[PDB]
Paper text:
APOBEC3 (apolipoprotein B mRNA-editing enzyme, catalytic polypeptide-like, family 3; “A3”) antiviral proteins cause lethal G-to-A hypermutation in retroviruses and retroelements by converting deoxycytosine to deoxyuracil in newly reverse-transcribed single-stranded DNA (ssDNA). A3 proteins are comprised of one (A3H) or two (A3F and A3G) “Z” domains containing Zn-coordinating His and Cys amino acids that, together with a conserved Glu, form the deaminase catalytic center. A3H is an attractive target for biochemical and structural study because the single Z3 domain possesses all three biochemical activities: cytidine deaminase, RNA binding, and Vif binding. RNA binding is a key feature of A3 proteins that is necessary for their encapsidation into virions and for antiviral activity.
Here, we present the 2.24-Å crystal structure of a full-length, natural polymorphic variant of pig-tailed macaque APOBEC3H (pgtA3H) bound to a short RNA duplex. The pgtA3Hζ structure was solved using the anomalous scattering of the native Zn ion at the active site of the enzyme, resulting in a high-quality 2.24-Å structure. A3H has the familiar A3 fold composed of a five-stranded central β-sheet surrounded by six α-helices, and is highly similar to structures of other A3s in the overall fold and in the active site18. Two A3H molecules form a complex with one RNA duplex. The A3H–RNA complex is maintained solely through protein–RNA contacts; there are no direct contacts between A3H protein molecules. Of the nine nucleotides in each strand (nt1–9), seven are base paired (nt3–9) and the two 5′ nucleotides (nt1 and nt2) are unpaired. A sharp kink in the RNA between nt1 and nt2 brings the 5′ nucleotides close to one another and results in stacking of the nt1 bases, which are sandwiched between the phenolic rings of Tyr23 in the two A3H molecules. The RNA kink is stabilized by A3H loop 1 (residues 13–30), which inserts into the narrow major groove of the A-form RNA duplex and includes a unique four-residue insertion (22PYYP25). The unpaired nt2 base protrudes into an A3H “aromatic cage” composed of amino acids from loop 7 (Tyr112, Tyr113, and Trp115) and loop 3 (Trp82). In summary, A3H is selective for RNA through a strong conformational preference for an A-form duplex with seven base pairs, but it lacks sequence specificity.
Residue numbers in the entry:
A (entry chain A): 1 to 186
B (entry chain B): 2 to 183
Write the structure that this text describes.
Amino acid sequence: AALLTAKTFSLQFNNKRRVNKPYYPRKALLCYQLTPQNGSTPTRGHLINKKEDHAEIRFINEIKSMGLDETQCYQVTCYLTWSPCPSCAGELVDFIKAHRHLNLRIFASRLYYHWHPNYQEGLLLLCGSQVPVEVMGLPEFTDCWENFVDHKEPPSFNPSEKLKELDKNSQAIKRRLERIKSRSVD
Amino acid sequence: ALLTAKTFSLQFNNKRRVNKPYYPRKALLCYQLTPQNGSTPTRGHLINKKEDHAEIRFINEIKSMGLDETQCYQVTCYLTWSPCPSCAGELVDFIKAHRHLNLRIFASRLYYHWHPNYQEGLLLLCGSQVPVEVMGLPEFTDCWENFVDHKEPPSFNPSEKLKELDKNSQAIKRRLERIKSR
RNA sequence: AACCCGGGGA
RNA sequence: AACCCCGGGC
Ligand SMILES: [Zn+2]
Ligand SMILES: [Zn+2]
C-alpha cells in the first residue's frame, strides 16, 4: 500500500462541485513530498481517512516520526483533496513555526467549507504564516499522478483525459480562492 | 384518513433539492371525486408500493368503488411527483374507457422532466383530455384545506408555508411550459 | 454524496 | 436526498 491505485486517484482527487451517481465518499487524502535542499533522495507518502478526521495531524506526527536532521533545510509539498479545517491550520502553523528547517507548500484539490468564515480564516492564517495555500491545477495534478500512483497496471480511464478534466474543473476553484484572498485585503 | 401538517410540508416540499437533514420525497396522490348531481365528494390519499405506483393504485381504487357509470364525475389529482410514462399510459387508457370521469392532474414537482420519455407521458395526458398543470398557490391551499388535519396546530405558520410553495413553483411552471411545445 | 442560493436541459 | 451542466456565497 505504498502507492495509490489509479482508481483511488480519480475518485479521491475528483474536484467536481458535486459527486455523481453512484455516490461515494470523497475522503481526506494527503500526499506529501519531502525534498532536502542538499539533494538527497526525496521521500514520498500519503495518508487517507474520513474528511471529518484530521489527516494534517497525522501528517505532522509522521514528519516527527522521521527524526529529521534539524541542521538541514527541507522543502515540503503537500497535495490535499480537501483544504484544511481551522484547527488543523493552526496546528500546521504552530508546527512550522517550531520547525523552521521545514518549508511547507499546500496545494488543495477542493476548498473545504470555503463559504464558512472560520474555514476561510484558517486558509488565510496559513498564507500569512509562510505556508502558501494554492488550488491544484494541471501541473499539480500531473505531478501527483506521476509520483503517487501505481503505474505497473494501466488505468481503466485515459490519464490524459482525466488530467484535462481535473484542470478544467479547477478554474472555478482557483477563482473562488482569489475571492477569499481579495476579501482579506479590504 | 388525513395527512399531518408535517407530512404535507415534507412531502409537497417543492424546493429544487431537499435540504439537510435529508429525507425521501416519496410519491403522494391526493384525489377528490365530485359527482355532477351534488353528492358528497369522496377524498383519499395514496402512497406508492414496492411494485405498484400510486397512480395505478388510484385507478384500481376508483374501479373498486363500483361507481354508477351513467353519472358524470369531476376528478382532481394533486401529485407530489408528476406521473411516469407507464402510469401516464394507464391513466389515458383508464380515462378513455371510463368517459364518465373527467380527470385533471396537478403536480407539485416534475418527475424526471429532463427525460424525453417522461415528457411524452405528460404530453400524452394533455393530449388525451387529462390536463396537466403545476401546482400553484390555489392548488396548495385547496389541498392544505381539504387533506390536512386541522385538529392539531402545525409547528410552522401555514400562511408562510404556502407562500414558499408558490414561490418555488414559478421555476417549475416555467419548465412545464418549455415542454409544452410539441 | 462537505453546505446554501440562482439558471438551464437538444 | 429524482439527474446532469453552469454561476455565486458579508
Ligand atoms: Zn482538520
Ligand atoms: Zn408511475
